[PDB]
Amino acid sequence: NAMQGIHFRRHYVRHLPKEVSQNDIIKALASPLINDGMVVSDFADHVITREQNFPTGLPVEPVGVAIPHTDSKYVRQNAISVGILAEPVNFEDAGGEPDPVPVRVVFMLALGNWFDITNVLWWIMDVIQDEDFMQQLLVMNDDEIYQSIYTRIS
Template sequence: MQDIYFRRHFVQHLPQGLTPEGLIPLLAAPLIADGMVVEAFAQHVIAREATFPTGLAVEPIGVAIPHTDHKYVHRNAISVGILSEPVMFEDMGGEPEPVPVRVIFMLALGESNKQLNVLGWIMDLIQDADFMQQLLTMEDEEIYQSILARMAERGEL
């Protein structure tokens, strides 16, 4: 994970009452501010989400993994959003029912091979039901440290 930026301020508890289109710019803002992505990154993620949704109905907590094309990325990065109440994302697999999402992993990946490696790592992470449940009760600093430790355990992505 040496070349994937994950900083403390890339972790946020997100406000209630927003749609995915309202949440994505909040998750993109620190990536934009730190120069990880282009200014229009959020708009491109929203557009991609409309065509290729990223909601995953995993138990016990729904997850979304919004991202966009590598050409909008300057440096590989991940931002994480935690929701106190679920927000409905369309299902990645095309199921008609939307997915109630409480954890969002926004990916900014400039290399396609990185995307597969990082998606594999996230899939492993979200299948750890205990860890995912703990994320919902942690403060932002704890979330950051826990995910950072998981990245270190995995090594190169």
């Protein structure tokens, strides 16, 4: 059960300011995982290179989400890093639709085994479809978000 084994720590949650670009976001959210040795040193650029060709924007209402990740060979330990954006930043639609997704919540995934992605996505679906959960993520502070996701993971 990937969710039960995923590492999710207090310093894996952060709010990013309104200036951030998509690459800024990905880099900022990789930072904790890199420092914790969960992923390779250059993880952010592999996630960035993947995003531009295979985007990970999920058009969910009212709060758009993205789930950027890369190949399992770049992951040492399973983990999730969460960013809350001050203003929406467009990620391309994962479904191939032409209109961008105005993303406010980023779930960066670091999975050491691709057979785990099904458990993890299934779980992300449950969450991002929870309108009150997702809305509260836009008002909570880093502490509250950690406790809320941490509880949700179980």
